[PDB]
Design a protein around this nucleic acid. Sequence first.
DNA 1: TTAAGTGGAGCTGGATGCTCTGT
DNA 2: TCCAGCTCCACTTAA
RNA 3: ACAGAG
Lengths: 97, 146, 538, 99, 103, 512, 189
Amino acid sequence: TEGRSRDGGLRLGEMERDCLIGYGASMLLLERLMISSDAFEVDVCGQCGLLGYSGWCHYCKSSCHVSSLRIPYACKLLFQELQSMNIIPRLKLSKYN
Amino acid sequence: DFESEFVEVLNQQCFKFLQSKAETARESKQNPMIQRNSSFASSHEVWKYICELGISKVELSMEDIETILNTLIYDGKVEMTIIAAKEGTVGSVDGHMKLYRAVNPIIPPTGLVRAPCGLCPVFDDCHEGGEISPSNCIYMTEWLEF
Amino acid sequence: KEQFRETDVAKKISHICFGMKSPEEMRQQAHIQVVSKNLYSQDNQHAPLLYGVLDHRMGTSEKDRPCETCGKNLADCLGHYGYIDLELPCFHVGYFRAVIGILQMICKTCCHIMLSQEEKKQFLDYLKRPGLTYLQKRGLKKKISDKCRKKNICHHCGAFNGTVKKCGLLKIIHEKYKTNKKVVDPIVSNFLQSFETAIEHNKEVEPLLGRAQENLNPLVVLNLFKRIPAEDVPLLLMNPEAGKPSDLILTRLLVPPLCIRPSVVNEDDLTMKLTEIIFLNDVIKKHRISGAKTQMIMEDWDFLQLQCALYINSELSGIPLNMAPKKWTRGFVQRLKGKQGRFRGNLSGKRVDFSGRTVISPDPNLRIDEVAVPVHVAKILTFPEKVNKANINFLRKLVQNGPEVHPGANFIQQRHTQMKRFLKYGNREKMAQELKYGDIVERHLIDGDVVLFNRQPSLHKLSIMAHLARVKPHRTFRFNECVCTPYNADFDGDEMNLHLPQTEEAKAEALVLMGTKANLVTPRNGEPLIAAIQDFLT
Amino acid sequence: DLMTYKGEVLGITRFGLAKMKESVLMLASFEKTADHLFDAAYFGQKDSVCGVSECIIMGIPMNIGTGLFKLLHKADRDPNPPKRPLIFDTNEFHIPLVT
Amino acid sequence: AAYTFNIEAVGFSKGEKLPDVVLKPPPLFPDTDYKPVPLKTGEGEEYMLALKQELRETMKRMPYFIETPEERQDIERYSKRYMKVYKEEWIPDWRRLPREMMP
Amino acid sequence: TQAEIKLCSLLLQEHFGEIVEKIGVHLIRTGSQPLRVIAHDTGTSLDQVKKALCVLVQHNLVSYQVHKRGVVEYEAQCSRVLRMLRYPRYIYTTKTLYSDTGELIVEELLLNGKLTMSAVVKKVADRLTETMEDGKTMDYAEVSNTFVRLADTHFVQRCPSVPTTENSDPGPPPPAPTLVINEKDMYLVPKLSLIGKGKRRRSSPIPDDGIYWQANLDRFHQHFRDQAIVSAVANRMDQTSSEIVRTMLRMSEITTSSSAPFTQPLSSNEIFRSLPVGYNISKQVLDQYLTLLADDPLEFVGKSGDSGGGMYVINLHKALASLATATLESVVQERFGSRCARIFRLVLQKKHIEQKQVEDFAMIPAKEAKDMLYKMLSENFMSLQEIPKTPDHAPSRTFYLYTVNILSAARMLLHRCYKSIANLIERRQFETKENKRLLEKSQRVEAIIASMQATGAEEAQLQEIEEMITAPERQQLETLKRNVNKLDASEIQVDETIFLLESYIECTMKRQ
Amino acid sequence: MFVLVEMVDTVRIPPWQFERKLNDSIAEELNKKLANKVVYNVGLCICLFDITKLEDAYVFPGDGASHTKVHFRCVVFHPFLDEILIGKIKGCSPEGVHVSLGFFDDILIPPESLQQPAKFDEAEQVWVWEYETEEGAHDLYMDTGEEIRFRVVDESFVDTSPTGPSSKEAPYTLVGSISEPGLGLLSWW
DNA sequence: TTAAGTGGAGCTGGATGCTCTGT
DNA sequence: TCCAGCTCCACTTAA
RNA sequence: ACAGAG
Ligand code: SF4
Ligand SMILES: [Zn+2]
Ligand SMILES: [Zn+2]
Ligand SMILES: [Zn+2]
């Protein structure tokens, strides 16, 4: 949350992101802006690219292409504000090698 | 409107007076140049029979039926030709005279209305894999039984 | 007996491919149909209507009443969609500048594209090359519309194709029957004389028929776009595997789940706009049955184009005065743009935890790579120390001290479990004798931890460095005054931030890359910044 | 050299950056956030996740800095090991029957 | 409750008779007042219906109907010569066809 | 044209297969392609592209032209594949003007695409050995006698033939040899002295090399053009006024082109001669008809001349406009009612009209007509003009004029038909997919009857056919066949709705 | 009756197993995920036969474990069609003869493919066989499980996958026949 | 005489720093 | 409060 | 929405 009265916590701004890139710290930028805010997992269908639930892709009516992806939560918020806008963010996943 | 349930019987009344006159020309079978002229009815003559039947107390006036006779064109059932007023019992139009003959429709109805896809209100939403498919349709499966 | 199944299906993202859905793939994604306009029932149960917006078959937005589609709480469910049907088609407010761009390049009689044959052979071979970038796709539609708008007769049917331009808020005109001072053409003569019926009962038709053009509506451009040939769709620069030209006009509208719109904001701005769309689905439908005039149908249908446009983007330019909003509502666009949007407020920079902010004060008895963290902050900011062979006898004592004595632990966590036992309750000398190899002790911040150290206007990269914390009892952050030059701090009521990393990799990237002993020079020209300051030069 | 590598002097505006950078998220996380989204929806434009500002949004680690090389593990292992011999199905004992 | 837009701009100048709110959604198949025209019958219309079944039974058996190539058969045996689906092979006129298509 | 691409993937599926439609539909969908990028943009092997194009160039469904660097690019024809649905309508209409010999000549040309005159008279002699008995053989001579009469009435035309390589471009071989069509010998048959007898299927050096014959699918359309116009004249006046239109059009066969608003005008002095002798009609009664058909505001015919007595022409494009008018109004009456079709004919004649004049001119009240006005704009049958008062274009300061556009409603109504046929094919291929259990069960019990039918066939296999449990199952198989007879017959009858629409769209396109 | 099946995988080796050789630790982990399990199109996977190619062992960011790609051949029980085995009896039912094959238990010998003199039991679960001279209608397939001989004429796979959101039927079936001369108990021949 | 390619003028839509600390 | 694109309209050359 | 602080 926002402020001291709400037990808020501090903000990695738009400019302190620009300073961690200058050091080349990649995993520290990952730990500050993904893991210690809003780490989350999503059922991503690799076939069509949409988002499923509990292994059940209601689009394809099948359960053989769902998969789990490490994502921030404010991106999963973004990928469903945009499907309501009819701007469909179809993903395509591959193996993590 | 004048009345909805009053004009629905005059649509049934004028065409029977316009078809049987052509049938008396059709059963005449003398000369198709004259059989065509024996098919046209006068615009004043068609007024003289409908007022004689005595269906309603209100007057079926001449200025009213002249607008009622346009509806039989719009069902594709009669024509209308305007000729010059050379001779007639009245000649209600100055220098002109209107004629009426009943006709058949031009073609038999097309093959699209014989299909269940043609008359359906949810025609646009039907597709292969989803809910509304022809594989699980009520409109066909009712129509294919009888 | 039992069939194989892959246990942990982890995959990496490769490429994000935008697009759009057809209005019969929206039916395949959602679960219910939304027909009711009213949010809550008339009784005291605070339960929403069972076929409207805020239905709990579309995800949950509170812990109290769980969802209905998958029976889980707020902390588990991803959210599920619903759809609204429209009895009249409408434009989508984003695609409207590309609805005009297609009607400039295709005909409006045969729906084919307006190019000669040698011109069609050139671009369809230009789009075959590998490595085709997004710049080389945007520049090509500029060149094709330079060729299509110079031609006004079709090479396939032969109809006249005048220009296509905007004539108001979401209205498209088409100059098919423009007139000139020259000899009257046969195609402009026949249209301008077939007005004989309308002039008979209406006198004002005669002055106003000099401006009569083909006003295009969503009912026409839905019909025109279903007949575009799919050999000529890629010369509209649309990708045919991400959307159709029939999809740019919406006849069915998805609603977001309740994870997108909270229950107590009471209701969100995008909830209140979905009430006004469903209500104007039943006002327009009422005037179709009860026989209103066309000047009331085209009036109420102007609202449905508007109430879907402000639903998406609530800062339009050319709204008439009788239809402008009185109060300000957030559309989908205004919660994507700006400083408090997604891309500047919640994605590129976001509020973190394991942080601290306190007034600073000087101390030269520390080294140049140290920082004095107070005891009140060091008891709160913890680090997950994984138990292994080296630190087991150290972490047993740090568990046995507890959450109050300073070298202690606030939590404990077992090997394959995801819960945390708060270490104040229960006996701690039993939980210290039951530690296994692989449990996680969350010990207090102690002497030697790597912690970052930030001042809030961060100009260059030495405005954030990593120091080695050393706990001291007083209530400030404290560091040697040789480090007042990189941060530009001055100790006059000045506050600085703190960030404790939580992973070992984040420790090692903070200690080697971002150390104070490894950043003694600025990257600008190579001059030293951590050096002597006043009272160390005098 | 960043301003002049496409034969034209491009600015550091939102118009010079819209000719240098290709990623839709990098274009739309800076200025004119909505128009790039509808344009990438229209063109069907696929985007890569190779750049920096769209690795931070997607939560994958960036390619610059410490994310440019991969660490292997020096395991005591035998690649392409000695296999087990097939006894029954060899080539010299199973000439097929048909001509 | 008043909304963002003006209801008076929409209509409703009397102040009453708002349209009703739908509780249960409409079904997938709304019933129609009218039915399709029945088929055109006769001895001349029926023979076209008979030959159309005699084309699916004929054109599937033609050598143009290229059947999909089989694969991943298990092993060889002696019951293969009895089950070999025999079908003659047609050669085209290569004077018409391009050179680029010989088998 | 998303409906045409879905239908072409069905017509190539039942008639040609699964691994051949991937090559044909992809040329309708994408465009002109060399052979190597067809396999890359589909994913098939290079051998299957050699098999799937040689069948599609056999039946003339794909064409080709030479380009830069000698590459060979193909191009499928969308309208030519959609006419594979009218194959039973092409075999039946040659059974009228020609005998059962000529019925099987075109049926060999349509199923095989291209044949030689040496081969087509063989199979018609072969396949008619079953239709005769008692030693009577079908000879090669009279089949050719029907074949040369087919070329006289233009139902069979020569293919665009290969040129002579010894006269044009000798030397290295070109990849695509640039085939070309001649104007003289489209119907000039080669002479044949060869005769013979057909084989009865007992199961126990070429003169016309390069001269290939294919079916003229345009002439059957010109033959179906006449029967639509004549029957439209037939229903209005009389059978006697019907034959006069049939008299001119049979004379107007060989003298006008496929797209002409006006044919060559006929003089009545030779109309009386070519009129059949079994009609009790004088030359004066002949001049009675020809002046009253021009008086009809349908205007099937025109005068267009004065020399040589009575000079008379017949319209073609105005007649197809009247046919597309009766097509566009017979679909309103069956979907929205009879009273709704009263309004669509009103706005058709009174070209631009408002709400107040419709309820007056048709005697349909308020709140009964406004439902039937609004459901036609929603189904794209009627359009608005919206003449403004101001350039603000506000709905409170303008008029709304209802206006029927025929041509935009003629393409849309045709687009409804292409999806309508494909939905019929999907229903038939659904009930046959889910019931291959029952048809194999009807196959096996008849295989006991079929296999060992006469050779060593005892009578102890006739009563064991109905012994299987299929005997109460026969109620569903009769329900399956009565569906197919209503699906495939409705599948043919929509082509009548297509052809009246397809001829009206073809005559208004200039192709400039 | 055993065949080989070649697959690929990515094997996570946790860092508490680095003291042991990689090839001795890959083979244990693959048997913890494939043994006594029917991979869908290939049959019942008994165990690993050999590992044929072992690529490099990446360490991905965010983990200490090493992930390596493994090419390997697994011995799999999959008989070809009409292979004649020897099998035992567990019990009988009106649905058919339930034949055990050691590790595997779901074999169908249906009454539609039993021997011709006896086809329907006398409301006894145990199946019968009638011969005129000796043992008339009182022969029985004994529940003690003597060895029979049969012929697997039909095999069929079913996709046993979760349908619906996640918060026992056999995916490997087998249908045989006994009607041939020489198929049945070994005591008869 | 006019078709057409290119100048100049007005309209339009976008943007304008980072956080905590309280009412 | 400041600044690039988009569209309308006169202004010469050329046939 | 306003005031502060660096
Ligand atoms: S739902 Fe079925 S019957 Fe109705 S239009 Fe679609 S396919 Fe035809
Ligand atoms: Zn899916
Ligand atoms: Zn849920
Ligand atoms: Zn056109």
